Design a protein around this ligand. Structure first.
Ligand SMILES: CC(C)(C)c1ccc(N(C(=O)c2c[nH]cn2)[C@@H](C(=O)NC2CCCCC2)c2cccnc2)cc1
Ligand SMILES: CC(C)(C)c1ccc(N(C(=O)c2c[nH]cn2)[C@@H](C(=O)NC2CCCCC2)c2cccnc2)cc1
Lengths: 303, 303
């Protein structure tokens, strides 16, 4: 039953446009009279290895940028570069612009992705920012410019714009001010992502979700200290658990009656012994892309 | 990377309303000047065990039905029952009504669910109709009236309206003409779902998705006949594979160069030997809630 659940996507759907520069097409985000999109739309195959974006942008004129909203052609009024995003001024403000803000999220946090091709939404799914600042998304060629977001009542918080795939199949992108998450650059070069680690506070949230849903077998009698837990966690490539994380798990602990450090003792045994062919929430691996908030809202129905 | 992916939900979001009858609140679908919702909204705790819906509806008047769209109160003009759904005539046609049709889907088919509480969308996820006509959804109390749908370009095909949870945690609902999928009834009584079986054509689609994504280890040298495959499949509670299913897998077979019956031979060995602790697409179990269409569109970017 318990599953990855995205935010309703309607407010973002009304913002997605197609941006074509030369032979290249990708997606842009139309808020008020500005369309945001990856600046690598202005590259050519002749310049992808080490483009000089300042020079490339100089050579462009407004009319080199074809922007379409549905089947409607928006005239670009001006163009500028903010870090790795291009801001295309258009002569019409998007009448479907929602209330929004730009936010830069933290590793371990989750968001919904509205995957788009040729400016048209194709699917919505929940994703997480990995500790190494990649996202393990589902993106095909031409998905660049698709955005990740969270919704707070009426307000859309945009946190990710998709830029590229790393040759290992994971994905890299920026905040909506164009700063990459992680060490990545928007050129065709060999790029290593760091070692990825497991998001411990999220695995704990998911164990609480298991308990909430009656899956309880992994619970044991014991407790542990944060330090003692963290010693084992390091050896299994788990992120350190902080007192902040303990405090963030407070609501789930209160709902189930299981102290955070008691859940930590259960996770410690699971790491040392594996699942012996049993499953938790219909899964044979420990899931780390549900936040405590994610669990709370799917198990409490936040709208 | 490969994951469950829902349709963009915007067109359905504009249709969700709150319906309150007495002390009970659930969701309704506002299309043109009609709001559709589960007829069990008219029950009371005193009548839930064996309600007489004809009599209960007789006793209701238009003003017993409180319908709200956002914070706007729609006046019910008339009320009628079509099988297990109530059709509330309201004096305003929904200006956000999309192009739509009502469809009754087949076991094994998938759809997106827009989960709603108090008439407000809370999340979107992909679901499948189980062979025993349950759906393994993520629904809390008050989610009744939430709908499942597919999108064909501009047209929303509604196929499911959520009615109730069965005490085993799976869910039961109707098409949008109010006919339950499966043997279930909308009263508080002991209700068995039949034995559930694995959707073989979907497991095959998901193995093709694995191959498309470079996960190839389970491939073997052999082929098999449909009959020979089906003999083994029965013993593992797999649905029979038909020639229609073979034909439906044609596109995926053509893309990967693996004949359908060769994939069937690989699945036959996986069933008899298990995965030996290996995973396919990051999963230690065989996934059966992706259709061949689902795979094609996520691996080809249908908008
Ligand atoms: C110019 C630059 C920065 C090198 C670049 C080039 C191509 C793209 N990719 C576009 O699909 C695409 C479409 N329109 C423009 N680019 C894809 C992409 O990353 N390929 C490769 C680029 C470097 C080598 C490895 C990956 C892509 C595929 C799947 C999901 N997401 C994006 C992204 C950035
Ligand atoms: C009257 C009738 C048909 C017996 C009924 C009663 C309650 C509801 N449930 C409402 O939550 C709800 C909210 N408003 C009105 N009903 C829930 C539901 O099925 N409980 C039980 C009903 C019979 C015994 C087992 C389950 C529900 C929970 C989680 C997800 N989905 C629905 C559905 C149908």
């Amino acid at each position: 039953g318990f599953r990855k659940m995205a935010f309703p996507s309607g407010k973002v759907e009304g913002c997605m446009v197609q941006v074509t520069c030369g032979t290249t097409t990708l997606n842009g985000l139309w808020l008020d009279d500005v369309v945001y999109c990856p600046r690598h739309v202005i590259c050519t195959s002749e310049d992808m290895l080490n483009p000089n974006y300042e020079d490339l942008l100089i050579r462009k004129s407004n009319h080199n940028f074809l922007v379409q909203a549905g089947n409607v052609q928006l005239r670009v009024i001006g163009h500028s570069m903010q870090n790795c995003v291009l801001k295309l001024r258009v002569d019409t403000a998007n009448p479907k612009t929602p209330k929004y803000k730009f936010v830069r999220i933290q590793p371990g946090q989750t968001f919904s992705v509205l995957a788009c091709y040729n400016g048209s939404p194709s699917g919505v799914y929940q994703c997480a920012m990995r500790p190494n600042f990649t996202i393990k998304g589902s993106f095909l060629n031409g998905s660049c410019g698709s955005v990740g977001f969270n919704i707070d009542y009426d307000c859309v918080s945009f946190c990710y714009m998709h830029h590229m795939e790393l040759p290992t199949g994971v994905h890299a992108g920026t905040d909506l001010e164009g700063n990459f998450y992680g060490p990545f650059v928007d050129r065709q070069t060999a790029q290593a992502a760091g070692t990825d680690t497991t998001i411990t506070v999220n695995v704990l949230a998911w164990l609480y979700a298991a308990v909430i849903n009656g899956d309880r077998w992994f619970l044991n009698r014991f407790t542990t200290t944060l330090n003692d837990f963290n010693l084992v966690a390091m050896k299994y490539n788990y992120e350190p658990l902080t007192q902040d994380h303990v405090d963030i798990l407070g609501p789930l602990s209160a709902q189930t009656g299981i102290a955070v450090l008691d859940m930590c003792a259960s996770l410690k045994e699971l790491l040392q012994n594996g699942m012996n062919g049993r499953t938790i929430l219909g899964s044979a691996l420990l899931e780390d892309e549900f936040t405590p908030f994610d669990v709370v809202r799917q198990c409490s129905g936040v709208t």
